[PDB]
Amino acid sequence: SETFTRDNNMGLVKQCLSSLYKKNIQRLTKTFLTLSLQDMASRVQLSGPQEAEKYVLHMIEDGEIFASINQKDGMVSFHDNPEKYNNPAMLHNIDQEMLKCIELDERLKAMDQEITVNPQFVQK
Amino acid sequence: VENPSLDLEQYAASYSGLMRIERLQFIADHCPTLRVEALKMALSFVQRTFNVDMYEEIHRKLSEATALDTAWVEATRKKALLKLEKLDTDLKNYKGNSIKESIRRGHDDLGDHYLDCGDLSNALKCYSRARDYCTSAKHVINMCLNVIKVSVYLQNWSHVLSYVSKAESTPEIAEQRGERDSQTQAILTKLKCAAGLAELAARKYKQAAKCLLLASFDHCDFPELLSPSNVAIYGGLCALATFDRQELQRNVISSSSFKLFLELEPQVRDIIFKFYESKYASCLKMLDEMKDNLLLDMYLAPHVRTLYTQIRNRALIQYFSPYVSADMHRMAAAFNTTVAALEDELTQLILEGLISARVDSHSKILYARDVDQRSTTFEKSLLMGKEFQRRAKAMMLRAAVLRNQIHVKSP
Amino acid sequence: VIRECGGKMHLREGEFEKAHTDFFEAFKNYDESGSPRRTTCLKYLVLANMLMKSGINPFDSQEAKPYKNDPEILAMTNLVSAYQNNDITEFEKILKTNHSNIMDDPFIREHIEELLRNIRTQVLIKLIKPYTRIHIPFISKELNIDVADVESLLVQCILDNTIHGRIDQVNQLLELDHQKRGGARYTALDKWTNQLNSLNQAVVSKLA
């Protein structure tokens, strides 16, 4: 705690500790299709189903995980099915990502032709 | 429970030489069989062996039980030296006659008495003289077995592999077929179940099994090496863990050569044949029944942990292979375990790319998942594009800083 | 010199390919010389040609024509016919009616389960051809076996690359693989993406 507060980045370190839980919960999605809240708050060491409920709810609200809570059974159901690429809006994403590369290549050509005509780059 | 579920007489009969003494000391300095078997079994053969003192570390252990061979200790010390003098004088005579082209007889008995004394590779130079004053490859093949025998008690497994490679590669495919119907001598069996043993000690299980399963039961009697029974276990457990189903069927189950080996080891035969037929409820139980009998083996104990874990992981993948939606209750009842521990095992297996499955821990059902090729392709291509644009921007900035020659001076 | 009794436990083992090949030779060699063994030889000659699921009907191919049919053993001659037609009903009917006469024999103990398992395999393989999702209890009716036996047979068949499908335990199903999406275009796109990911780094690293 002395080094982390002498360098003034104390508070950016506690974010790593808080992010470890959010990383473990996301790692639960690669093995499970339906988990119990009491059972879930024993592998990520959250110590309580009540706190695991809000930990999952916050991650759902931020678009970090794809899941749904069931307070009746008290179980978290992982969906893991965001998108199928047949949307007329994904075409917009591909178009924008293509236009950015087109502009980048145009810039590269522009600052390449300025070297092609350099009088110093004719003697070597 | 550690119990003496072995008979010492058959172990003593199978082996001969220093290997028998080493095996007897190994089982002794573990903690089965000592109580009354140890003193009788070990002391019987120390009369003809050297270094004398090997008993004392195990001798005082009888005190808590609450020998008398004290005069014999000084008896062997004075008599050991006499055998060395004649052979030390003998090698001078062989050089005196200048018959070095035919002194191969001189090293015929020179190397055996050295190994009888528990000496070291210092004698091995004589076998080098075999390479220098011989013409036909037959003497080289002869001395290769001797050097392998003396290197077995040397922990020089890589050195053993190099010499087996030399002995198998230098001649023409080991005398081709060996004057038809195989050679009269069984040196092929030794070159097979010595390189396989060395690969086993090198933690190369698949190659060890592949070499050991190719042995022959013609002579197969190896007092200086692993017993015929041990070949079956070494080649069976090492094959159940690394061989695929097709390889298991072609090289083990259908092979006539290994069936004779499996005849005298019923437990391994039943284990293999019930693993193949998808009967894991009792295959694992029989595998566990003999776990505290291979831990007392000298060449297989350290790997018992690695093999038994590797076999089980190969069963779990095989059990969940024809199924698209399996019940975890019957899955756990067929592995002699509980659902709570089976869930941990399956989670560990799924975390790595071994099983493509998802656990439903509400009705306890293991579902088989299928990856969407199109979505995965789109995701990875978009990620690659993002990384490429980031690298392009970084490189352009690097070009700007390099052109302007921006750096921090030492001052 | 006799292999009975004193040498019998050497021959008590089941592996008989050596005699399987020699049966065709012994059909003629000991025909007029091995008279005591002729009664048992004619029954066993069928087995050798029966194990490879080939050889049409040995009822009249070779010189066994004088023997042809024998009045006491007739379903034994039709056993190979039923095997060739892959009709389980004829096989089971023959076994139940003519028991103690086809089965009586010893050498049939070691081979009856082998025989009445390669008919069910072909019947099941043909049965699943037009379906994409089948019911295990429905297969349990065509084959005169229980559910627990047909599930094990399906597992063994699926393992040895003979049935391209997967079982559904909780629903007692069998889902067969029938659809083949484009698997060559996306693999090519993956290879192209993965190769560009390395070419870009190689190009960028030149500006060190």
Curated annotation (Swiss-Prot), chain A:
Q: Where exactly are the transmembrane stretches of this chain?
A: none
Q: Which family does it belong to?
A: Belongs to the CSN3 family.
Q: What else is known?
A: Amplified and overexpressed in some osteosarcomas (OS), suggesting that it may participate in TP53 degradation in OS.
Upper classification of the organism: Eukaryota, Metazoa, Chordata, Craniata, Vertebrata
Q: What does this protein do?
A: Component of the COP9 signalosome complex (CSN), a complex involved in various cellular and developmental processes. The CSN complex is an essential regulator of the ubiquitin (Ubl) conjugation pathway by mediating the deneddylation of the cullin subunits of SCF-type E3 ligase complexes, leading to decrease the Ubl ligase activity of SCF-type complexes such as SCF, CSA or DDB2. The complex is also involved in phosphorylation of p53/TP53, c-jun/JUN, IkappaBalpha/NFKBIA, ITPK1 and IRF8/ICSBP, possibly via its association with CK2 and PKD kinases.
- Name of protein: COP9 signalosome complex subunit 3
Assembly and partners? Component of the CSN complex, composed of COPS1/GPS1, COPS2, COPS3, COPS4, COPS5, COPS6, COPS7 (COPS7A or COPS7B), COPS8 and COPS9 isoform 1. In the complex, it probably interacts directly with COPS1, COPS4, COPS8 and COPS9 isoform 1. Interacts with CK2 and PKD. Interacts with the translation initiation factor EIF3S6 and IKBKG. Interacts with ERCC6.
Question: Where in the cell?
Answer: Cytoplasm; Nucleus
**Naturally occurring in which organism (per UniProt):** Homo sapiens (Human)
Tissue expression, as annotated, is: Widely expressed. Expressed at high level in heart and skeletal muscle.
UniProtKB/Swiss-Prot annotation, chain B:
Q: Which Gene3D superfamilies match?
A: 1.25.40.570
Q: From its record, what is one biological process in GO terms?
A: protein neddylation
All copies of domain PCI, residue ranges: 211-373
- Keywords, comma-separated and alphabetical: Cytoplasm, Nucleus, Phosphoprotein, Signalosome
Question: In which domain of life is the source organism classified?
Answer: Eukaryota
Does Nucleus appear among the keywords? yes
Free-text tissue specificity from the UniProt record:
Widely expressed.
Q: What is its main location?
A: cytoplasm
Does Cytoplasm appear among the keywords? Answer: yes
Instruction: Note the subunit structure.
Output: Component of the CSN complex, composed of COPS1/GPS1, COPS2, COPS3, COPS4, COPS5, COPS6, COPS7 (COPS7A or COPS7B), COPS8 and COPS9 isoform 1. In the complex, it probably interacts directly with COPS2, COPS3, COPS4 and COPS5. Interacts directly with inositol kinase ITPK1. Interacts with CAPN8. Interacts with USP48. Interacts with ASB4; this interaction negatively regulates GPS1.
Q: What is known of its domains?
A: The PCI domain is necessary and sufficient for the interactions with other CSN subunits of the complex. Mediates the interaction with CAPN8.
Protein function: Essential component of the COP9 signalosome complex (CSN), a complex involved in various cellular and developmental processes. The CSN complex is an essential regulator of the ubiquitin (Ubl) conjugation pathway by mediating the deneddylation of the cullin subunits of SCF-type E3 ligase complexes, leading to decrease the Ubl ligase activity of SCF-type complexes such as SCF, CSA or DDB2. The complex is also involved in phosphorylation of p53/TP53, c-jun/JUN, IkappaBalpha/NFKBIA, ITPK1 and IRF8/ICSBP, possibly via its association with CK2 and PKD kinases.
- Name assigned to this protein: COP9 signalosome complex subunit 1
Organism of origin: Homo sapiens
Q: Which gene encodes it?
A: GPS1
Swiss-Prot record, chain C:
* Source organism: Homo sapiens
According to its UniProt record, where is this protein located?
Answer: Cytoplasm; Nucleus
Function per UniProt: Essential component of the COP9 signalosome complex (CSN), a complex involved in various cellular and developmental processes. The CSN complex is an essential regulator of the ubiquitin (Ubl) conjugation pathway by mediating the deneddylation of the cullin subunits of SCF-type E3 ligase complexes, leading to decrease the Ubl ligase activity of SCF-type complexes such as SCF, CSA or DDB2. The complex is also involved in phosphorylation of p53/TP53, c-jun/JUN, IkappaBalpha/NFKBIA, ITPK1 and IRF8/ICSBP, possibly via its association with CK2 and PKD kinases.
Q: Per its record, how is this protein called by name?
A: COP9 signalosome complex subunit 2
Residue ranges occupied by any PCI domain in the UniProt entry: 19-181
Q: Which family does it belong to?
A: Belongs to the CSN2 family.
Subunit description: Component of the CSN complex, composed of COPS1/GPS1, COPS2, COPS3, COPS4, COPS5, COPS6, COPS7 (COPS7A or COPS7B), COPS8 and COPS9 isoform 1. In the complex, it probably interacts directly with COPS1, COPS4, COPS5, COPS6 and COPS7 (COPS7A or COPS7B). Specifically interacts with the ligand binding domain of the thyroid receptor (TR). Does not require the presence of thyroid hormone for its interaction. Interacts with CUL1 and CUL2. Interacts with IRF8/ICSBP1 and with nuclear receptors NR2F1 and NR0B1. Interacts with NIF3L1.
Post-translational modification here is noted as:
Phosphorylated by CK2 and PKD kinases.
